[PDB]
Tab-separated table of C-alpha atoms and ligand atoms in Angstrom:
chain	number	residue	atom	x	y	z
A	29	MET	CA	127.708	134.325	78.846
A	30	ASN	CA	127.598	131.046	77.408
A	31	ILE	CA	128.281	127.459	78.054
A	32	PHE	CA	131.689	127.785	76.315
A	33	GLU	CA	132.711	131.144	78.101
A	34	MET	CA	131.113	130.102	81.451
A	35	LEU	CA	134.354	126.987	80.591
A	36	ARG	CA	136.818	128.403	79.629
A	37	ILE	CA	136.773	130.942	82.605
A	38	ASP	CA	136.551	127.268	84.466
A	39	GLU	CA	138.537	125.112	83.607
A	40	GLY	CA	141.118	128.204	81.124
A	41	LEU	CA	143.593	127.547	78.735
A	42	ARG	CA	147.020	125.650	78.575
A	43	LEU	CA	149.400	125.465	75.581
A	44	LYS	CA	151.665	122.751	77.238
A	45	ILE	CA	150.781	119.558	78.935
A	46	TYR	CA	150.002	119.871	82.194
A	47	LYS	CA	148.782	117.853	85.704
A	48	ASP	CA	145.171	118.781	87.123
A	49	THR	CA	144.322	119.504	90.077
A	50	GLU	CA	144.137	115.552	90.950
A	51	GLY	CA	147.136	115.248	89.443
A	52	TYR	CA	146.323	114.093	85.627
A	53	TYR	CA	148.482	115.298	82.315
A	54	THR	CA	146.178	117.715	80.803
A	55	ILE	CA	145.351	119.825	77.840
A	56	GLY	CA	144.190	123.190	76.637
A	57	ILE	CA	141.073	123.563	78.274
A	58	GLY	CA	140.588	120.925	80.873
A	59	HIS	CA	140.789	118.165	78.704
A	60	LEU	CA	141.997	115.159	80.860
A	61	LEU	CA	144.645	113.078	78.502
A	62	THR	CA	145.367	110.445	80.515
A	63	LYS	CA	145.003	109.283	84.429
A	64	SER	CA	148.463	106.747	83.084
A	65	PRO	CA	151.237	108.630	85.629
A	66	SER	CA	153.417	108.128	82.224
A	67	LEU	CA	154.317	111.946	80.529
A	68	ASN	CA	155.183	109.525	77.679
A	69	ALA	CA	151.797	108.292	77.946
A	70	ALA	CA	150.724	111.175	78.109
A	71	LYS	CA	152.796	112.223	74.478
A	72	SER	CA	150.799	109.871	73.120
A	73	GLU	CA	147.625	110.063	73.566
A	74	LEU	CA	147.423	113.820	72.966
A	75	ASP	CA	149.572	113.263	69.320
A	76	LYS	CA	147.094	111.006	68.788
A	77	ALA	CA	143.897	113.689	69.911
A	78	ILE	CA	145.796	115.910	67.473
A	79	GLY	CA	146.239	113.954	65.049
A	80	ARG	CA	149.851	115.306	64.508
A	81	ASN	CA	154.082	115.071	66.982
A	82	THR	CA	152.877	117.817	68.908
A	83	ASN	CA	156.228	117.358	71.374
A	84	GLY	CA	153.629	118.549	74.128
A	85	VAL	CA	152.953	121.667	72.650
A	86	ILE	CA	150.149	122.800	71.268
A	87	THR	CA	148.565	126.125	69.000
A	88	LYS	CA	145.522	128.197	70.638
A	89	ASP	CA	143.634	126.571	67.557
A	90	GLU	CA	143.935	123.051	68.473
A	91	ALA	CA	143.927	124.033	71.581
A	92	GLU	CA	139.757	125.260	69.947
A	93	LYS	CA	138.611	122.198	68.429
A	94	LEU	CA	139.198	120.279	71.291
A	95	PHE	CA	137.473	121.953	73.390
A	96	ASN	CA	134.714	121.933	70.130
A	97	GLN	CA	134.425	118.345	70.888
A	98	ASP	CA	134.194	118.259	74.444
A	99	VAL	CA	131.051	120.813	74.942
A	100	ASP	CA	129.571	118.388	72.375
A	101	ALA	CA	130.298	114.883	73.621
A	102	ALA	CA	129.242	116.382	76.831
A	103	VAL	CA	125.805	117.813	75.540
A	104	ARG	CA	125.377	113.876	73.342
A	105	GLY	CA	126.652	113.013	76.174
A	106	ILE	CA	123.895	114.003	78.364
A	107	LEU	CA	121.115	113.321	75.887
A	108	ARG	CA	122.012	109.579	75.540
A	109	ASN	CA	121.796	108.958	79.413
A	110	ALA	CA	118.908	107.853	81.111
A	111	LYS	CA	119.441	109.764	84.598
A	112	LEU	CA	120.062	113.168	82.902
A	113	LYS	CA	118.088	113.467	80.359
A	114	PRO	CA	114.742	113.749	82.191
A	115	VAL	CA	116.489	115.926	84.543
A	116	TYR	CA	118.198	118.213	82.295
A	117	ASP	CA	114.544	118.284	79.791
A	118	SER	CA	113.044	120.128	82.785
A	119	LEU	CA	115.688	122.619	83.498
A	120	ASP	CA	115.844	126.279	81.817
A	121	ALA	CA	118.879	126.720	79.624
A	122	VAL	CA	120.992	129.071	82.448
A	123	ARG	CA	120.677	126.187	84.446
A	124	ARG	CA	121.191	123.304	81.590
A	125	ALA	CA	124.713	124.944	81.477
A	126	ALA	CA	125.439	123.971	84.825
A	127	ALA	CA	124.210	120.413	84.317
A	128	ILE	CA	126.563	120.745	81.048
A	129	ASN	CA	130.013	121.595	83.012
A	130	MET	CA	129.743	119.397	85.708
A	131	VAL	CA	129.777	116.501	83.116
A	132	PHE	CA	132.493	118.477	81.370
A	133	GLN	CA	134.293	118.561	83.960
A	134	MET	CA	133.229	114.267	86.009
A	135	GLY	CA	131.904	112.526	83.777
A	136	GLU	CA	128.362	111.150	82.458
A	137	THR	CA	129.548	108.570	84.516
A	138	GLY	CA	129.871	110.723	87.670
A	139	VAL	CA	127.040	113.466	87.558
A	140	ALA	CA	124.490	110.216	87.226
A	141	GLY	CA	125.451	109.324	89.955
A	142	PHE	CA	124.553	112.431	91.723
A	143	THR	CA	121.245	111.040	92.520
A	144	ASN	CA	119.918	112.437	95.347
A	145	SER	CA	121.109	116.594	94.151
A	146	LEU	CA	119.188	115.103	90.057
A	147	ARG	CA	116.048	114.578	92.303
A	148	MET	CA	116.237	118.054	94.018
A	149	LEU	CA	116.534	119.860	91.263
A	150	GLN	CA	114.036	118.184	89.103
A	151	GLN	CA	111.834	118.492	91.195
A	152	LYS	CA	112.728	123.073	91.085
A	153	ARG	CA	113.746	122.338	94.926
A	154	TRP	CA	116.092	124.238	94.061
A	155	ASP	CA	118.573	125.313	97.438
A	156	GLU	CA	118.220	121.919	98.810
A	157	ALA	CA	119.572	120.482	95.509
A	158	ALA	CA	122.650	123.288	96.806
A	159	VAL	CA	122.780	122.278	99.292
A	160	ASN	CA	123.170	118.418	98.382
A	161	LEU	CA	125.219	118.954	95.964
A	162	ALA	CA	128.194	120.774	98.238
A	163	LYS	CA	128.746	117.426	100.681
A	164	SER	CA	130.982	115.688	97.679
A	165	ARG	CA	134.058	114.955	97.517
A	166	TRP	CA	133.804	117.220	94.100
A	167	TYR	CA	133.015	120.419	96.325
A	168	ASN	CA	135.792	119.423	98.531
A	169	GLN	CA	137.779	119.103	95.950
A	170	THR	CA	137.874	122.394	93.778
A	171	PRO	CA	135.199	124.808	96.187
A	172	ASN	CA	135.974	127.982	94.091
A	173	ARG	CA	134.395	126.220	90.941
A	174	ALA	CA	131.902	124.351	91.889
A	175	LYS	CA	130.035	127.329	94.480
A	176	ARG	CA	130.604	128.803	91.035
A	177	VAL	CA	128.720	125.485	89.220
A	178	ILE	CA	126.409	125.618	92.492
A	179	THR	CA	125.207	128.805	92.804
A	180	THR	CA	124.162	128.963	88.910
A	181	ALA	CA	122.352	125.786	89.608
A	182	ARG	CA	120.407	127.199	92.665
A	183	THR	CA	119.527	130.686	91.282
A	184	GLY	CA	119.219	129.715	87.025
A	185	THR	CA	121.436	133.584	87.001
A	186	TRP	CA	125.111	133.913	85.403
A	187	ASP	CA	126.261	136.040	88.840
A	188	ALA	CA	128.691	133.756	89.957
A	189	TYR	CA	131.128	134.827	86.702
A	190	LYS	CA	130.253	138.502	86.032
B	203	CL	CL1	140.317	113.576	71.364
B	204	CL	CL1	138.647	126.030	92.791
């Protein structure tokens, strides 16, 4: 199990524009296209992203290219962030996949926001961090995925995904 397989489980794969849990226009593997209500703005962003006229539909390959860019952007975003970087450096490779999951789903800014949890993670206070992470809109909004991520952080094992 790795970060790519973990995310593919959590986000699914969809070849046609769709709406996320929050209601945003998304495509492929969790790739947020826009927060704008227009399905036309979405189609617009979509073709810009792919480099062709898609009419809201893409191939598996295309979807895979997008996913590769986003994980890379997630990682680089973590490494470039003054709040995130130290937590990350401090962690083992499984736990690291967990911070990467979060950043991919809620953006660098969001996660950088989780001040307290971050501090507990760095101090390697697992249980307490787990509890604190659950006291969030994130957890309330998508609880089954959040539980899986939270367990990965608390444990350093891939249990929740096996
Ligand atoms: Cl893009
Ligand atoms: Cl969920």
